[PDB]
Amino acid sequence: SFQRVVHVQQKDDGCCLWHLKPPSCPLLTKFKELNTKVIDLSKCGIALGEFSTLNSKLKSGNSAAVFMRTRKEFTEEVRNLLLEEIRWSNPEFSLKKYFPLLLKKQITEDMLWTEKYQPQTASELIGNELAIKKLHSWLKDWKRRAELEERQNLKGKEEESRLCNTVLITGPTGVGKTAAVYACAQELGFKIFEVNASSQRSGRQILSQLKEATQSHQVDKQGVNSQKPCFFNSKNATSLILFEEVDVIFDEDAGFLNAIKTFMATTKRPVILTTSDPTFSLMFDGCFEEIKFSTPSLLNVASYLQMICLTENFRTDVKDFVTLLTANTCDIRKSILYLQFWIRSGGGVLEERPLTLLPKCDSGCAETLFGLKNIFSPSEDLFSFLKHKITMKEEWHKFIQLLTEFQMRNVDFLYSNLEFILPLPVDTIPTTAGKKCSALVSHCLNSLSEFMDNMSFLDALLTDVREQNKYGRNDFSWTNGKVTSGLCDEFSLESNDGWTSQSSGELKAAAEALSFTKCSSAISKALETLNSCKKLGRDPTNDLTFYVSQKRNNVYFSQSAANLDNAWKRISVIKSVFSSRSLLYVGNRQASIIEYLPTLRNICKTEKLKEQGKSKRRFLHYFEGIHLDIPKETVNTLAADFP
Amino acid sequence: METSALKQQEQPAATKIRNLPWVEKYRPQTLNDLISHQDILSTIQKFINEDRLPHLLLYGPPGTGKTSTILACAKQLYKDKEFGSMVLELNASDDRGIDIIRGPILSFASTRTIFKKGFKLVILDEADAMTQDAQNALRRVIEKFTENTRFCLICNYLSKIIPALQSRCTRFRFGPLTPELMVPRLEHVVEEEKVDISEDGMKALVTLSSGDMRRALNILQSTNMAFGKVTEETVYTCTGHPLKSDIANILDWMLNQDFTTAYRNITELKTLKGLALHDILTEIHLFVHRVDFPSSVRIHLLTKMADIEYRLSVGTNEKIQLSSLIAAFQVTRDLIVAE
Amino acid sequence: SLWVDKYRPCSLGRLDYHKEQAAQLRNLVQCGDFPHLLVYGPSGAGKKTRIMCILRELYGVGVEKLRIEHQTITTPSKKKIEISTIASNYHLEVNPSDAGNSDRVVIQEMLKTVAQSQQLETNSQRDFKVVLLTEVDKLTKDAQHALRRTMEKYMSTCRLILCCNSTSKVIPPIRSRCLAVRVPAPSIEDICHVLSTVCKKEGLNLPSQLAHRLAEKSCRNLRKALLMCEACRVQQYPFTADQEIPETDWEVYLRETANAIVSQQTPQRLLEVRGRLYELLTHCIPPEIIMKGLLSELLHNCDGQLKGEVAQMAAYYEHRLQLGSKAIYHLEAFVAKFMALYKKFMED
Amino acid sequence: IEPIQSRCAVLRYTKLTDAQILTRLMNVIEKERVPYTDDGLEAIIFTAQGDMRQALNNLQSTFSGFGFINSENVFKVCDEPHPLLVKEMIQHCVNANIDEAYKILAHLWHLGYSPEDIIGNIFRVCKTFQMAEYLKLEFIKEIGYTHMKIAEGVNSLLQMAGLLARLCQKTMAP
Amino acid sequence: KPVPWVEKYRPKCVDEVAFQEEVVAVLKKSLEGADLPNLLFYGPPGTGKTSTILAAARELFGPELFRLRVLELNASDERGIQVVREKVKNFAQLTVSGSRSDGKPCPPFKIVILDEADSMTSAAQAALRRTMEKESKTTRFCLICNYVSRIIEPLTSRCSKFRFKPLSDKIQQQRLLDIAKKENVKISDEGIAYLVKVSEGDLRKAITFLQSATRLTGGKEITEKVITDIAGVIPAEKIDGVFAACQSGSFDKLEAVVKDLIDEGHAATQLVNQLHDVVVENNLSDKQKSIITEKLAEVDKCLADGADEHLQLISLCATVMQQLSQNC
């Protein structure tokens, strides 16, 4: 057809703007002629080493250093010296009660170290002591009940006890929930029937295949009973059901929750649930005894990992496993597996360190953990590279690759260790000459302010690799943050961009490295004149030193410049006080925190002040007198002070 | 599913008595009939004739002739009696997830041909719209079945293809047509179609097209059938582009008068022509490098208009941004004029 | 049940201030076809009290019998996210901004659940279920576009009551349909009268000048005034003329940080202020609040010439903070730039 | 997901240093009798940023296409914006010549190069450019700002020329 | 049960929209041939583009087939254009047989009225171009915008373009008087004139604000206070107080003024709009106007970004105060 698509405009006559003419002023009539002549690229050839780090000379013999390490077995005296060294490193560790156990465990291998050093007894576990004693007491009571039932059967031919038939265990990944369950079961001779997420566990399958495990006896009661049937469908020992990763429900697992609720109702045998999802304690409807595994103490697990290193006849230091644990968030499974991979590869660096508190130390685990040994020469050290002046192209490329390897994880490396990396003294927390000293302090402060301005620029006006606050909001918030990973097999089908990830990573790494180089160079040339002020008699080093916490000096480097245990106890405090019945309906969130929480802390502190004055007892009863049901531990936490 | 029959008889579908599809009137047939990118086409034909055809990655702006080129290569490589048994073409219209790679692609690349022995060809139009996991499977299908079959991926944006899929192929960019060799096509079609046109019409046609023939012929036939004549005014009216005289008067108002009178005149002309601030900024930017300004003035103007074009995207009030655009010139060049 | 909740008005005739506003709202709901209500005003002006009042005047008395439910839904990137929700059989209230930049699901699919629930439920009272999205100002642009198309599509099944502190981040097609309810912060005498009524209903007799001091210290925030009155009741049984108004504890922490920055000018003090600011940020206090508090605290010490420069610096770095991700960089860089400006100002 | 990383040992692979890709490229060339010059070596190493697969594929493509390994053939097959043109961009902007820099960038834009690979090539050349450290830092910062502007969706000639003006003005302003 | 006012008194058919002469004439010529081409309407909001296209759809079809044969869609969907293209494909694939008892059978093509077409990226615009070319003879597209320059060359070249000049103040005042007398609302001319002034020449916002006021204050007169507080417009006394505070040169009263504005619940974007509208039409120097307008643009970018209102207004007022007191 091809009808006329007429541009119709209501062009009325007049208005002095519809029919315009080019201006008569000389500026807009002096159009410069366009030139298209660029330089010719055929004449100019690209020389070697221009756009890359190509050099004519090549290093030979410095690299490809094969280890061929044949570690001599330690004798008794050197082993005892290492034992006393670790005991002086950790005076609060019962290091004598564990070393025969691991020595018996060690006495051409086809085991992972997780199962080679598997704890047979719950007392061999490290950390979470209250939780494992609670579990052990619960299972001992279940054994006593089973033995009493057998006694009643042999003779024949429950609010006060409050024996709930199920424990639900929750904690972080790899803290040893399954290790605790298995260790308790082997110590008291139970028989675990495990249901994993790797198996098809639908409701009709699990009830028709595992109900009579609870309802009836075991036909085999003597002999091989410490064996673990993993349920799947394509002295006497008592049954014990265990559900590993209960929070993982697929569409194939149809009606799993109703099935384990029927198991809840109609059991006569212990039922154990293991999950790492904190929200599953709220969603599940049933009666169960709750056990929480906290994150274990860093020094205790570090001593245990040093210990696993000792029983494989290597010596080492505490601090490297401290930062190794920090990088893995105190995950014992990840640390043990990487420790196995690292020890069985023959070690990284042979450096001797004579400490009394002898073979050579094996420091340098966290450097190879982050892949920093693939960037640097084995002679190079990280902080040695970072403190000195970067001038060559290859050192620049090493700096960029280090920062890039730290930028994909959204970790600010130079920022977190800014005190230990600047050429300035760092100490742990416990007149014309004055004009020049103040000028030096001013120059150092100007350099610091400039660097931190570029760092703010980098966070604000530069793209990050991983999109921050993607599922929760920014850090230190009590809305949520328990974003469990996906649970459906359907694909993401997202339209994210890929180029702006490694492009932005290179960009942020290069900008951070250049800004830090500028700042460190400025600080260096500022303190090059500090000798003149020292000769003048005035020492501004008290105003130039950096005060940093004790916990950040226990590591070689940190991935964070704050305290996360502090933030964890805070977030627990707001979540616990604002889960009470009356204050659970304050919807305006920001208003709720900045108005209710400081006034509540003021009320708590005033209440403690009146209680310290030997006043009447009823002054304790304002919190109970307004029906404000807050637990006493959080009231005591609120009544201390504001940090 | 399907969706190929509608296009397949959509291409030979016309009234043939009244409609005039000038874009579809002149179409290339073979490699010797696409008079553009002679190096690319000769390279592809040399790859075909030596039986050394590698995985091709045809990328560039749309309308440059990638799909018709690879259709000509497929028709010359395999005859009509075995075209369907040896060539597998897919687009992004049949998008069901990432199962398209594991479906027809994996089954077709993992078997021999049926009737006549030879290497097969896979053509994937709009491969940048494919998801990252589907492309991560397509690279493995490419890697393990490279000997039996070759892959030709047609895309518009090169950045949306993963580095591995790029690194398994050789890249060919269909660049825009230099205006010179483009103009002979326009004079051929006007001499055939008996159209009144001036040289300003040719300048506008080669300016708005920016190196394509499809939208060029579209603009040409639309302006011709709407007005009967093709000039600068009629083309920029039919296209509804910023007229050069209007941008010149805008720059005159920002360069001569005071703030308020320039503001009122610009706002009146903007509501008179329906002209946005983004197109004003683009055309004023093209205008800045032609008008003889000092280096500092040019730098300051370019920085301010880049900032305003960024601010306009996040969705602020365009009125304030327009007044700030006036302010960007009132700060420097009217002060220099007063000096 | 504090005085901010035990004595919260639930009827439109109980509101002592904004009586014309309350009468207008009552007359609006007497028509029975009220639109989406975009209610704005500063925090503590009483927006939540007003929307509960119009809910009670709209529905029956059953909107007081509320329940708490957690909803878990699937991301388009195939991840499960859980979020709390205060809901009833008559209305549902969901905060959508707890999902970061993924607020678009909590906008769209949650509204789908309310629509299907209203299609399932029938009570012969009203033909809509009120969906209350508190803190809609913090929603992203993509989420607000999803919100716009959902109000265009779901208008005959549910009615939307948005509550915000500002209509700046709100996109203009949203405000083009929602009825605007500007609730200004009530005046000093309104706070004094509310405090007098609350204290009389509690069996106490406070003086007028203590109520005026409390109203002036609260900065026209009624909830803060009520909480400070409750704390003063904790401190002393009689409302004395020398009753010390309970100062906000993180506010005086911020004031001590202000004395820390203004007192000594050295990078060691900069690190100490950095540590204090980290400690203050770990208390989940939003960064714009410390930004405004720091501005108000240091603007006392500067002269009249430095105030404009410090103000523009604060606004620029606040915008950098809002664009950015880690607030600590932008905040502490403002500390550093103010430190440099102060040091180069008192040296000459 | 975090449970697998807990259940594994995480080994990190880095981008290959240009010496390594040069050595294995020379191994392939000496095993395949490829005629070459050092300019072609630098061009191939540039077109493959630490990517051995891309280097080998580009080398095979130019040897199958033109048969000789120099810079001109490699950039005729890889078809990137030419790094000498981008080096002349950066060199003009060091001298604060907005006219020549915008001349060369208008030439690049009219050749059909997208904004994304143009700013990518500008960053890649500017990373190894010979200038002062502070000017390199400010150049990198402005390049990253403009690159995020291209990433967010605004990608026109005006943004490119604006970045050119900012890079020029960083030299003429203290 | 009832409908909002804006969709109630829109014209039922063509030729009933006033102030437009050639647009309705070409529309009537296209309707007499029973063939609407691909249509593009551009003009400022509250002018009648949506009313004209809806009236044309009602005229060409039957009212019982009016809703079934048109599809209203917006281009600002958050999931890209994949959902929009699949919706258009679903609408064009589905065909509903229709019959009119008036004597004219319905034309076969379906109508997709797409709003906010100028908020569309070039890739999405080319995708829409290929979608329209796929359904050229089965679905005629409607594109609604204010700025035709944002629409790229191919869709703009293939569409019949129509300009909608906004209505004068007298015409919209007369129409609002007709609305007031039709809906039994007691109205003075001053209130309608102030409604026209605060709607900024948009009839849709004026009608919406009138309906909002007559439902907020039912059975009562419509004063200026309710219109001011419903339209969101800052009072002029507040703006003059801001100007006097910046002219004073004292920062303390400046802080007091912005604290009064913030605590009154006044939006910062509206304050910035009124401040700019007063600044650009005053006797200030061009340098002062330039610097003030640049700061206004930066602050409005910060507000649309989502920064703090109080700090942004403090900074803008500090810049205005320094610029005004620099000459003193």
Ligand SMILES: Nc1ncnc2c1ncn2[C@@H]1O[C@H](COP(=O)(O)OP(=O)(O)OP(O)(O)=S)[C@@H](O)[C@H]1O
């Ligand atoms: N506290 C611990 N003491 C000693 N070894 C431990 C400890 N926690 C974990 N392990 C080791 O880590 C291995 C695996 O621990 P698991 O119990 O499987 O982790 P988990 O608690 O189940 O967390 P999941 O299953 O990954 S969510 C055990 O076999 C031990 O070798």
Ligand SMILES: Nc1ncnc2c1ncn2[C@@H]1O[C@H](COP(=O)(O)OP(=O)(O)OP(O)(O)=S)[C@@H](O)[C@H]1O
């Ligand atoms: N070099 C050319 N010279 C003349 N006409 C051309 C040329 N390239 C393409 N065309 C026209 O474009 C039609 C088909 O080109 P396409 O292959 O669709 O373009 P394209 O490069 O593949 O970009 P797409 O298809 O829009 S993604 C041909 O039938 C011609 O009418």
Ligand SMILES: Nc1ncnc2c1ncn2[C@@H]1O[C@H](COP(=O)(O)OP(=O)(O)OP(O)(O)=S)[C@@H](O)[C@H]1O
């Ligand atoms: N000239 C006119 N004749 C008749 N009614 C008009 C006229 N101008 C505006 N209106 C009415 O004003 C109201 C709003 O106009 P609409 O057409 O719905 O929206 P608009 O003018 O397209 O602006 P948008 O949709 O926001 S871009 C409708 O009720 C129209 O009937």
Ligand SMILES: Nc1ncnc2c1ncn2[C@@H]1O[C@H](COP(=O)(O)OP(=O)(O)O)[C@@H](O)[C@H]1O
């Ligand atoms: N008319 C009134 N009389 C007494 N107290 C009121 C009145 N209106 C509001 N309040 C109190 O003021 C506080 C304001 O808090 P809220 O309702 O959350 O408003 P916002 O959402 O603006 O912070 C409420 O806790 C309420 O108890």
Ligand SMILES: [Mg+2]
């Ligand atoms: Mg486990």
Ligand SMILES: [Mg+2]
């Ligand atoms: Mg094509």
Ligand SMILES: [Mg+2]
């Ligand atoms: Mg409309």
